[PDB]
């Protein structure tokens, strides 16, 4: 309780960084699912739709070529296999580390 109180822009709160393997899953999802950010938010329960849109906005700055290359390398779609691939690869990443 004091009149010195600071006010500044807190809307940039600390969000969880993105993993390289998580990025690899993101690309195989563009290969596998498409650009339906709501659907991708469902395949990644740890990421919400706005996180997917921000991820796309960051990727498009340099990696448009990889976006297209993944999008043309199409794969049949299965949510269940997708979830298993995620947690297995994450567990493998932790075990390697």
């Amino acid at each position: 309780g004091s009149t010195t109180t600071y006010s500044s822009f807190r809307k940039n709160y600390y969000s969880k960084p993105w993993s390289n393997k998580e990025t690899d899953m993101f690309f195989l999802a563009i290969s596998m699912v498409g650009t339906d950010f709501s659907m991708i938010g469902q395949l990644f329960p740890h990421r919400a739709r706005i996180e997917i849109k921000n991820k796309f906005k960051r990727e498009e700055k340099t990696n448009g070529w990889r976006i297209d290359k993944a999008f043309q390398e199409k794969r049949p779609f299965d949510f269940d296999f997708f979830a298993h691939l995620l947690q297995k690869v994450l567990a493998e990443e932790e075990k390697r580390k």
């Binding site: 010195t4 109180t5 006010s7």
Partner: protein
């Protein structure tokens, strides 16, 4: 409306000091504030730099002895406010004021002025260590302003040979601002 009223009387008042009582938030109240002003198109001054410092500097507890501040921390207010003027005038002409939150400038200047008045006594202190004595919560940009201003003052320091000879740096430059 109360805010613009005070601005008409060039009466110093800051943004959060109002929002303190109103359950508001920066974006909510700032966006709305713009809305009425553009709606009414009334002429209103800006916050003039020197006005806010008088009330801000006077709020510190450095002017009397207390169990939290023995005398070595105590200081004369007139000297401090003068020194802060002689620093803030540099800040504006060196482009540092424009386009930034104004208050961090004041905090940085006051911290260093207070140190430089008794550097042998006060070089050992820090941002938060200083502020919590005055029960002041500090800007995080104040670190940015501090690094900026030390960078400036060393560049002044080299201009004088009888300052150049001492090979001044971050640690030592503080105790010569009275000279500069």
């Amino acid at each position: 409306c109360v805010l613009i009223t005070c601005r008409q009387h060039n009466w110093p008042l800051t943004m959060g000091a109002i929002c303190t009582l109103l359950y508001a938030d920066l974006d909510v109240f700032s966006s709305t504030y713009m809305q009425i002003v553009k709606l009414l198109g009334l002429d209103v001054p800006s916050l003039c730099l020197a006005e806010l410092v008088k009330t801000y500097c006077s709020s510190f507890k450095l002017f009397q002895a207390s169990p939290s501040v023995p005398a070595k921390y105590v200081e004369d207010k007139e000297k401090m406010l003068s020194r802060t003027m002689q620093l803030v005038e540099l800040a504006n002409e060196t482009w540092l004021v424009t386009g930034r939150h104004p208050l961090p400038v004041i905090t940085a200047a006051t911290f260093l002025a207070w140190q430089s008045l008794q550097p042998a006594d006060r070089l050992s202190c820090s941002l938060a260590r200083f502020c919590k004595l005055a029960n002041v919560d500090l800007p995080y940009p104040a670190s940015s302003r501090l690094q900026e201003l030390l960078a400036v003052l060393l560049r002044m320091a080299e201009q004088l040979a009888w300052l150049r000879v001492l090979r001044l740096d971050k640690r030592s430059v503080v105790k010569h601002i009275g000279d500069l």
